[PDB]
Write a protein that binds this ligand. Sequence first.
Ligand code: MG
Ligand code: MG
Ligand code: ZN
Lengths: 559, 563
Amino acid sequence: AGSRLLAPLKKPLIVSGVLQALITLIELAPFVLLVELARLLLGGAEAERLWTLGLTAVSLIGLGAVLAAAMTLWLHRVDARFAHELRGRLLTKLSRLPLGWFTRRGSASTKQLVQDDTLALHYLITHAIPDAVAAVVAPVAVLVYLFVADWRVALVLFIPVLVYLVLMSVMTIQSGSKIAQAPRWAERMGGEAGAFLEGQPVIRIFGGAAASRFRRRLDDYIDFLVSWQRPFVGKKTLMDLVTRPATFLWIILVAGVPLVVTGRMDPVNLLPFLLLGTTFGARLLGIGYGLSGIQTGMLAARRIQTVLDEPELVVRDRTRPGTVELDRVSFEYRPGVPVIRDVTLTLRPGTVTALVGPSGSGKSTLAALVARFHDVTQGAIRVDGRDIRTLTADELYRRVGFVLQDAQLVHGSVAENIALAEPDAGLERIRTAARDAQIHDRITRMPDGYDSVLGAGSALSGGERQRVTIARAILADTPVLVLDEATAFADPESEYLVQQAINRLTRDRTVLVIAHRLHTITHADQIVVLDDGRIVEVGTHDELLAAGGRYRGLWDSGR
Amino acid sequence: IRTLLRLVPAEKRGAVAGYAVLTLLSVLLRAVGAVLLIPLLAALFSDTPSDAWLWLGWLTAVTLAGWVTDTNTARLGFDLGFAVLSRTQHDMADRLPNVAMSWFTPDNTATARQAIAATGPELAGLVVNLLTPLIGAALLPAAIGVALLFVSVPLGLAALAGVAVLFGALALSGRLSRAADKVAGETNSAFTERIIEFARTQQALRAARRVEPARSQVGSALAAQHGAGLRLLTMQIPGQVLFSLAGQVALIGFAGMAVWLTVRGQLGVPEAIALIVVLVRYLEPFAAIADLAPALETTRATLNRIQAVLDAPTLPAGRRRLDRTGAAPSIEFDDVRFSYGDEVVLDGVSFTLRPGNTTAIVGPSGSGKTTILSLIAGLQQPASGRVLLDGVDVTTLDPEARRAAVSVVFQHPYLFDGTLRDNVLVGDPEADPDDVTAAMRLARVDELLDRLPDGDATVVGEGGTALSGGERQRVSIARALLKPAPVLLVDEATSALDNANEAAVVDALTADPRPRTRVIVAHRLASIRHADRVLFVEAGRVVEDGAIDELLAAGGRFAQFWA
Ligand SMILES: [Mg+2]
Ligand SMILES: [Mg+2]
Ligand SMILES: [Zn+2]
C-alpha cells in the first residue's frame, strides 16, 4: 500500500542509502585519525606527523558536516517536491470523487488527509533511510574496529546496545496500537474544533462552554495522549540514558580500569574505546526515536493511497439541445435507503419546470443528480441527448448552471464570488449580474465596494448572500438553470424582483425551480409534485388545483 | 522562554522552579562527569594506575546522579508539558464562547482553529522534546568551561570563549530565518483554511468549475505554500552554516589553547589526550543546538497563536439575575444602536414587548431583524443604548442566567455532527424522555423519525448537511422548544419548510404550553398568524407597529409588503 505510493522515490531513497553509508564512514574517519594521533602523541613522534594527523582530522570533520548538510538539504527538497505533487494529486482526485464521500467523511477528515497525512510522510521518505543506514553502518564499523583493538572492553559495549535494543522493541510494541489510534483521534478532535468554531451561536445559547461536547471530547483526547505519551516518553528517555556518550564512557572505564590497574592491558590500547566507542550511541538513537515516525508514515501512506484508490466519477466513452431528460432515475445515498424511485422527467428549452413537494421528499437530490454530484443507482440522465456520465466536468457544467439550497460563499471579494463560474469575466458583466440579482445596491453600500471580502465574520445577511449566489448563476449564463430554493430567505419585494429578472433572462433556456413558496411557481409550464421520492402528479397550476391532489393540500395549507 | 512562563499555571510554578533546579543540576553533573576524565587519564597513564580508582569512583557517582536527575527531569518536564497543554486548552475552550462575536474574523477564526488543533502530541511533549535538550545543549559547554577552570584557568577561559560564539550563532540564526518561517507559517495556514473551504463548499465549486487545482483557490494556496516551503529550506542554510562555523571556531579555540599548554609544558600529555574526548563532548551541543533551533521558531509561532486566542476580548458581563423562576419577562430596547464595523444596523430602535404576548418582526431583506434577535439573546451587544429583560439590562446579567433566559431558532440552523436526538437534547440534556418526545412532536420531527430509516439515531453530517434544509430546520426548532427559557426568538424557522409543515410548526409555536415572550421573524404572512403585535423593521428602524389586521387596514408599509 505504502510502497505503491512511494515508488516514484525509488532512486532518491536508494541513493540516500548509499550516500549515508559513505557519509557516516567519512564522519567516523576523523576519530580513527585522532586515535592514531593520540598513539603517536604518547610515542613522542615528530611534530610534522602530529600536525598532519590533527589537521586532517579537523578537515575531515568539516567535510563530513558539509556532506551531511548538503544531503539533508537535497533530501528535504526531494521530500518537499514529492509532497507538493502528492497534494496536487489528492486535490485532483477529490475534484472527481462522488460527493457523498465528502458528506460522510467531513471537512475535518479532508483537512487531515490533504495536509497532515502528506506531512506525516516526512520522516519516512527523508529521515528514515538515512537514520537506519547510519545506525547499521556506524555501530558495525565502530564495533568491528574495537573488537580488533580489544575484545574484552569491546564486549561490554554490547550491554548498552542490548539494553537499547530491548527498550526499542518493547517501546514499539507498547506504542504500536496507540500510533494506529492516533490519526482517528486527531480527525475526531479536528471535527469537534471545526464544529465548535463554526457552531458558536448554538454554543452561546444552548449550554455554553461547559455543556459543550467539545470540552468532553477534549478531555477524552488529552487522557488518550497522556496514556500514550507517559510510558512512551518514559521508555524514550531511558534509551537516551542508555545510548548517551557519557554512559559508554563510564562503562568503558569500568571495564577498562580494573584491567589497566592489573597487568592485563596497556592504557595506550584504551584510546580507541574512549575516542570511537562513545560516538556510535547517538546514531542508534536515530532509529530509536524514528520507529514511531516510520510507523506513522506507513499508516499515513496507507490512508493516502486508500483515497487515491477510491472509486470516482468516471467519464465513459459512450458519448433537442438544452434538453435535460431523466429516464427512470433512481438513487440512494446509503444502499438500502432509497430517496428517488423511478422518476421520469424531461426538461425542455423555453420552459419552466416547478419541482414542488413536501420537505425531505428528494427535490434537492434530484437537482444534485442533474449536477452529477452523485451517480444514479438506476436509469439515466441525458443533457442534449448526451448522458451525463459520458460528459466531462467541463462539458457537463458548460450546459447546466445552478443555484444551490445553501448560499455557500467562498473566502474572497464579492466580485470573485459572483465571478466564481467565470473569473476572467469583466467587471461590467459582474455589475450587470449583480443588478439583476438585486444585490448591486447593497454592494455599493459596502466599505470596499465589490472588492470587499466575504469571509466568515465579515458575512452578509441570509437573503443577501443568497442573492449573491443567484448573481453567480446568472453570470455563468448556462443554457440550463436549476434554481434549488432561490428566494427562500428573500422578502416578497426582493423575491418578486429577482424572479422577474430570472424570468427575463431564461425565456430561451431550460429552468428547474424548486420552491416551497408555491405562489412564485404558478407561472411554470409544468409543476411536478415530488413526494416520498416519486412524482405523485404533474400538471399546470390550474389543473393541479382542480384535481384536488397533494398540490391542493399544500396550496390550501399555505393560505 | 518568556512566553512559556506566561502560559504556566500559577499552581504549576512550583514544579517549574523544581524543574529548572534539576535541569541546571543535570547539566553540572554532565560537565563534571566529562571533566573528571582528565584526572582519570592523568592517573591511569601515570606510573601508579591505582590512583584512577578515586576518579572512577567519583565518575560513577556523578554518572548515577546524572541518570537519576535526568529521569526526574523527564518526569517533571512531562508533567509541565501536559499541565500547560490541559490548562491552556481548557482556558481557550472556556474563553471562546465568551469572546466577542466580532472577533471571529476569517484570520482570527483560522488562528483559533490552529490553536485548538495544536492539542496533538507535538505541543504536549514540548518541554521534554524541546526545552530540556535545548537547555542541556546550551548550558553544557558553559558548564564544561566552568569545570575546566579547576583543571586549568586559561583552559576554562578558552572553553567559555567558545560559548560566546555559540550564543552568538544561536542569536543570529533566529533572525536569519525569521521572515521566511513567518511567511511559511502564513501560507500553510491559508492552505489549511482553503482545504476546509474546499471540503465544505464542494458543491458550489464543482458547479462553478473552480475545483481543479489549476483553477481552484486551494490549488493556488498549495502552489504558494510549496513555494514558501522551499524558500524556508533555502533560508535555513545560513543558520546551518553559521552553527557549523561556530563549532569549528570553538574547536580551533579549544584545541589551539590545549596544544599551546601541552607544548609549553604547563599541561600534561595524558591530560592533553583526555581533552580530545572532553572537546568532543564539548562540541556535541553545537550540533544539537542546530537541530533544535528550527523547532523553537515553530514553537514560538504556536504559542503566539495560543496566547492570541487567550488575548481575545471577552464580551462584557455582570452578576445581575432575573427575579422570576422562568416566568415570562418583558423585553424592551431603550434607544438601541448597533453597527457591524462602521455601518449602522440599528438607529435608535425603541419598543416595549409585553411579558406573555407574541411579537412578529417583518420588513425588507437586510433590514437588521436577526440583529434585533441577536441583541435580545445577548450574542451581540449594543454600541449604545440598553436592552432590558424584565427591567434588568442584559449587559449586566450573569452569563449563566443570561443564556438560561433565552432560546433561539437561528436563521441558518447549524447542527452538530452526531445523532438527531443528540442535537435535540442540546437544548436541555437533563430533559425527560416525555419532554423530548413532546418537543420533537411540536417541531414535526416525529415525521422525520417515521420516514428516516434509523429514526432519532440518524447520524447528521458536518453541520446539517446529511439532512434536508427543512429537516435540519425542524431539528433546530425541536432543540429550541425543548429549552425551558421564557424568551423564544424564532428567526425564520419555516423558511425551508413546505406549506403543510410550515402550518404545523406555526401552530405548534403558539400551542407550546408554557408562557414565553415570543419574537418571530418571518417572510411568510401565514407564519405570523398568532402574533399579538408586529414590528416592521426597515433600514434599522421600526417604521410601524400594531396588530396584523390593524396594519393591514391602515394600508402602510405592511399592506404593500404582503401585496
Ligand atoms: Mg433541499
Ligand atoms: Mg435574518
Ligand atoms: Zn526533517
